[PDB]
Amino acid sequence: KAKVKATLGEFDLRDYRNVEVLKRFLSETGKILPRRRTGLSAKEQRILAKTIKRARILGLLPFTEKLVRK
Amino acid sequence: ARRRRAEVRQLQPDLVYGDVLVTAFINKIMRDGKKNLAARIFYDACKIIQEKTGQEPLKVFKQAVENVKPRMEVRSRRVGGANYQVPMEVSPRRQQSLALRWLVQAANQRPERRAAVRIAHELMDAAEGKGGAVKKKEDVERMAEANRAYAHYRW
Amino acid sequence: KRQVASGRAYIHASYNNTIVTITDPDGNPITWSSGGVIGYKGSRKGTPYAAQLAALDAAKKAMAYGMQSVDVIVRGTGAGREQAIRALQASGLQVKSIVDDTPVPHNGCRPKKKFR
RNA sequence: UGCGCAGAUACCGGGAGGAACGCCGAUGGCGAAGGCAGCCACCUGGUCCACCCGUGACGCUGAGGCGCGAAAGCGUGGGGAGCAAACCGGAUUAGAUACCCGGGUAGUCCACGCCCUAAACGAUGCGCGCUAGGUCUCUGGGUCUCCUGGGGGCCGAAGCUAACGCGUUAAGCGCGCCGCCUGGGGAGUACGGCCGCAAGGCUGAAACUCAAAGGAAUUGACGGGGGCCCGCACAAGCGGUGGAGCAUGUGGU
Ligand SMILES: [Mg+2]
Ligand SMILES: [Mg+2]
Ligand SMILES: [Mg+2]
Ligand SMILES: [Mg+2]
Ligand SMILES: [Mg+2]
Ligand SMILES: [Mg+2]
Ligand SMILES: [Mg+2]
Ligand SMILES: [Mg+2]
Ligand SMILES: [Mg+2]
Ligand SMILES: [Mg+2]
Ligand SMILES: [Mg+2]
Ligand SMILES: [Mg+2]
Ligand SMILES: [Mg+2]
Ligand SMILES: [Mg+2]
Ligand SMILES: [Mg+2]
Ligand SMILES: [Mg+2]
Ligand SMILES: [Mg+2]
Ligand SMILES: [Mg+2]
Ligand SMILES: [Mg+2]
Ligand SMILES: [Mg+2]
Ligand SMILES: [Mg+2]
Ligand SMILES: [Mg+2]
Ligand SMILES: [Mg+2]
Ligand SMILES: [Mg+2]
Ligand SMILES: [Mg+2]
Ligand SMILES: [Mg+2]
Ligand SMILES: [Mg+2]
Ligand SMILES: [Mg+2]
Ligand SMILES: [Mg+2]
Ligand SMILES: [Mg+2]
Ligand SMILES: [Mg+2]
Ligand SMILES: [Mg+2]
Ligand SMILES: [Mg+2]
Ligand SMILES: [Mg+2]
Ligand SMILES: [Mg+2]
Ligand SMILES: [Mg+2]
Ligand SMILES: [Mg+2]
Ligand SMILES: [Mg+2]
Ligand SMILES: [Mg+2]
Ligand SMILES: [Mg+2]
Ligand SMILES: [Mg+2]
Ligand SMILES: [Mg+2]
Ligand SMILES: [Mg+2]
Ligand SMILES: [Mg+2]
Ligand SMILES: [Mg+2]
Ligand SMILES: [Mg+2]
Ligand SMILES: [Mg+2]
Ligand SMILES: [Mg+2]
Ligand SMILES: [Mg+2]
């Protein structure tokens, strides 16, 4: 499987308002993908976590979703 | 059998019907090593069944056996304290042994006086679907589908 | 007496029981079944067989109200959580979709000693 | 046991309230220790790097003192969802003052004030200097296969250690300073003292008694430990014994 950073452009890791890019870093559910799947660095993931959470308080990214399978 | 598969014994074909199933049935009738007695019992019973009914005794032997074969049984398995009666299928080999054994043990519970009389009559009843053998088979198949709730313990 | 003909079927699957509710698309229930509704009483209620028979009882109870299309919601883990779904598929109800909505807290409430 | 026909469980919607922050999440980070996980803002401490700019030995340790100090517990006033000592039941059991199940008070949370213990652990005081490397990682800087600082890991040179192991994050080589040990039990007891509302803490003996107490490692036994594997050990199956009468041997008388 490819990683998210690999298939992506030059984006601002701090911009909490960009949903189009942040939604790429959530799972099927609303969870935050581990660095193994996001391809980010330790620092980069540390920043993404915060900006995703900020965006979740704004109603932009979800806290959790429902799994359609099984 | 802890090491190997314990291969099945290959019986000798029947001296009369050239058929192995018959030889095995004779073996289950035989007691105290009297195979001549058992064979004369079986064959005189073949005369009985072939006369009192005008059909070939071979086909009736096979049919009677076939109607006693159980397709499912129950086996205990030790699970978290007291064990459970757990249904599962029956090996074709085991269907064989069980059906023949049940046939003989049932025939000797018959009221008839002579051996070959009981053998013939039980063969006829079991081939028609009645008779004690078919009741042991129907009761075992009742053991499955009753404890069916444990179908996840298959093993 | 309702004629919904389409709705939701909720599979609540715990280790001690599996119970099925069947509702209209607005969530309001129609009929339901459970492990105790069919004959079983004790531990046998949490078995996958009882999950099958509960699912089927509730599906037949849905037929009389006209149900054909069903969306399946699933909450919980336990034996016969899958078996209840597989019974729901061959129940004659066409299964529209299947979702797992099992509620997990974000570490809010202290569990019983049993769950630590 | 409990709850449910006064309609529970399951499902949808609305509302209240308390507590804790899923994923990120790490073998990760920060802190002197205790300890610190949603998010935003304010106030605020430590720490690291680069420049080589300023002061000019201003340093290290540290008996007393003073401040901090998980949980539990104490006082007053709140609060009180979930859990839950004590306690009330239900089971289990030889018994069950327990493990399991249904409940439930303190408490767990807040404020303010007490208490000062701990497997408070790296069971390893602080500071400096010297002694091969290799590898993973967090975070700075650089002429950015790499080089160079500061943390966190794993192997391992020299060396040390009783051994396990330690090994530039020393348990190696040295130096300064503080704290502490001196056989097991009696005993963290007794007395006095200081402190505390209390519970209790800090200090801390003796008589008496014993030929031990202990550390690490070794072979072996054992495990209601693990992996693997045999035997009529189980299973599948056939015939028996246990019952009768008798033969015979033994116990008892
Ligand atoms: Mg149950
Ligand atoms: Mg599983
Ligand atoms: Mg836990
Ligand atoms: Mg009632
Ligand atoms: Mg009642
Ligand atoms: Mg009442
Ligand atoms: Mg609701
Ligand atoms: Mg509210
Ligand atoms: Mg209240
Ligand atoms: Mg985690
Ligand atoms: Mg200068
Ligand atoms: Mg000068
Ligand atoms: Mg100092
Ligand atoms: Mg001091
Ligand atoms: Mg304290
Ligand atoms: Mg406290
Ligand atoms: Mg209090
Ligand atoms: Mg109070
Ligand atoms: Mg409770
Ligand atoms: Mg309790
Ligand atoms: Mg009790
Ligand atoms: Mg009792
Ligand atoms: Mg006992
Ligand atoms: Mg600690
Ligand atoms: Mg020292
Ligand atoms: Mg200093
Ligand atoms: Mg290293
Ligand atoms: Mg760089
Ligand atoms: Mg640190
Ligand atoms: Mg280093
Ligand atoms: Mg050496
Ligand atoms: Mg080492
Ligand atoms: Mg050096
Ligand atoms: Mg050193
Ligand atoms: Mg040493
Ligand atoms: Mg002494
Ligand atoms: Mg003490
Ligand atoms: Mg004194
Ligand atoms: Mg005193
Ligand atoms: Mg006093
Ligand atoms: Mg007391
Ligand atoms: Mg030892
Ligand atoms: Mg062993
Ligand atoms: Mg045992
Ligand atoms: Mg034996
Ligand atoms: Mg046996
Ligand atoms: Mg005898
Ligand atoms: Mg009798
Ligand atoms: Mg006898």
Overview of this protein structure:
- Chain A: It comes from Thermus thermophilus (strain ATCC 27634 / DSM 579 / HB8).
- The structure is cut from a larger assembly and holds chains A (70 residues), B (155 residues) and C (116 residues).
- Chain A is mainly α and 70 residues long.
- Chain A is 34% helix and 0% strand.
- Chain B has one domain (1-155): Ribosomal Protein S7 (Orthogonal Bundle), CATH 1.10.455.10.
- Chain B contains 6 helices and 2 strands; from the N terminus they run αααββααα.
- Chain C is of the alpha/beta class.
- Chain C has a 5-stranded mixed beta sheet, covered by helices on one side.
- Classes of the chains: A mainly alpha (70), B mainly alpha (155), C alpha/beta (116).
- Chain A binds chain C through residues 66-70, and chain C through 74, 82, 85, 97-101.
- One magnesium ion binds at residues 16-17, 42-43, 45-46 of chain C.
- The structure holds one RNA strand of 253 nucleotides.
Morphology of chain B? globular
Instruction: Count the beta strands of chain B.
Output: 2
Strand content of chain B: 5-15%
Strand content of chain A: under 5%
Shape of chain A: globular
What's the architecture of chain B, going by CATH? Orthogonal Bundle
Structural class of chain A: mainly alpha
Rg of chain B, alpha carbons? 18 Å
The biggest beta sheet of chain A reads: none
Task: Count every helix of chain B, treating DSSP H or I runs of 4 or more residues as helices.
Answer: 6
* SSE sequence of chain B, one letter per element: HHHEEHHH
Which structural class fits the helix and strand makeup of chain B? mainly alpha
Order of helices and strands of chain A: HHH
Function (chain A): Located on the back of the platform of the 30S subunit where it stabilizes the close packing of several RNA helices of the 16S rRNA. Forms part of the Shine-Dalgarno cleft in the 70S ribosome, where it probably interacts with the Shine-Dalgarno helix.
Keywords (chain A): Ribonucleoprotein, Ribosomal protein, RNA-binding, rRNA-binding
Organism (chain A): Thermus thermophilus (strain ATCC 27634 / DSM 579 / HB8)
Family (chain A): Belongs to the bacterial ribosomal protein bS18 family.
